[PDB]
Design a protein around this ligand. Structure first.
Ligand SMILES: CN1CCC[C@@H]1CCO[C@H](c1cc2nccc(C(=O)O)c2[nH]1)c1ccccc1Cl
Ligand SMILES: [Mn+2]
Length: 297
């Protein structure tokens, strides 16, 4: 009846030596991580970048998310979104936000997605460009002050602004930036893969965890087949890029049909990498702030 958590994906704790170059480290962990689709990477304890967005100006109108919309077939600052998000969660669970077990939010999320008796609606500050108010990482833009002790983070290969993003092509010889996600409890992203089957890297700057599910690329067609069988027939003929706007599916349904699924709780200061053609989806445990970019190898 209640949700059964998938097995945990790999977590890596690189030494300072291994942490020198992201692409080299990702290439070395690939034989394991590609078999789980997603992995988590914990930087060394002393690697702590400052938060570098323009907080005074940061304003956005999040999208509304009706958790049960398939089954059924306003403007905020960072501060005022946080107040709304914490009030929502503490009221929903009748306890302080940090006291709510991650497993309980997870079980309740999947219950609500399939419930026709209770219509829970949340908001997500999703797909906000780093160009609007800056990246959460420091950048040598000349647009914001960088303290000496922060320069190493502006120059780090793990700063998402410094990941390689240009794919090799003939058109490149003939002829972009990270996105931000301000989460609250139950805000979510449905199953998808990246454009061009790209890798992605995701960093949780601060706040409560982001819960992830991943499927390895060798099972991509299995997942697509389960979607074909069980996803709303009204949307069955839609191209993948549109279907993936609403590809909501409980991980246990995929697991029951033989699709390998792995989970993790990404906590503040931790990276999640998604491998090429690894389907993923997830939800936020509470008020948080993430940055993500597609990268090339
Ligand atoms: C146009 N393309 C095509 C592929 C996705 C990309 C657009 C961004 O799609 C959002 C998203 C993707 C994603 N991947 C990792 C983590 C998170 C996070 O929210 O933390 C993510 N959010 C998304 C997708 C579906 C439903 C809600 C939302 Cl918000
Ligand atoms: Mn993604």
């Amino acid at each position: 009846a209640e949700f059964v958590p998938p097995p945990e994906c790999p977590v890596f704790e690189p030494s300072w030596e291994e942490f020198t170059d992201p692409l080299s480290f990702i290439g070395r962990i690939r034989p394991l991580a590609e078999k789980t689709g997603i992995c988590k990477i914990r930087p060394p304890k002393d690697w702590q970048p400052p938060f570098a967005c323009e907080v005074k100006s940061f304003r956005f109108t999040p999208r509304v998310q009706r958790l049960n919309e398939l089954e059924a077939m306003r403007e905020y600052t960072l501060q005022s979104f946080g107040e709304m998000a914490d009030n929502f969660k503490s009221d929903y669970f009748n306890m302080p936000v940090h006291m709510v077990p991650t497993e309980l939010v997870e079980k309740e999320f999947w219950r609500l997605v399939s419930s026709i008796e209770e219509d829970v609606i949340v908001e997500y500050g999703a797909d906000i460009s780093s160009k609007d108010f800056g990246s959460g990482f420091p950048v040598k833009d000349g647009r914001r002050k960088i303290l000496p002790e922060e320069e190493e983070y502006a120059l780090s290969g793990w700063n998402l602004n410094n990941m390689p993003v240009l794919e090799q092509s003939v058109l490149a010889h003939i002829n972009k930036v990270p996105w931000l996600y301000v989460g609250m409890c139950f805000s979510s992203f449905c199953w998808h893969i990246e454009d061009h089957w790209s890798y992605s890297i995701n960093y949780l700057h601060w706040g409560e965890p982001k819960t992830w599910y991943g499927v390895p690329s060798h099972a991509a067609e299995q997942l697509e087949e389960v979607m074909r069988e069980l996803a709303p027939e009204l949307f069955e003929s839609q191209p993948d890029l549109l279907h993936q706007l609403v590809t909501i599916m409980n991980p246990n349904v995929l697991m029951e049909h033989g699709v390998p699924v792995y989970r993790t709780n990404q906590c503040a200061g931790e990276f999640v990498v998604t491998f090429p053609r690894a389907y993923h989806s997830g939800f936020n445990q509470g008020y948080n702030f993430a940055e993500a970019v597609n990268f090339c190898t």
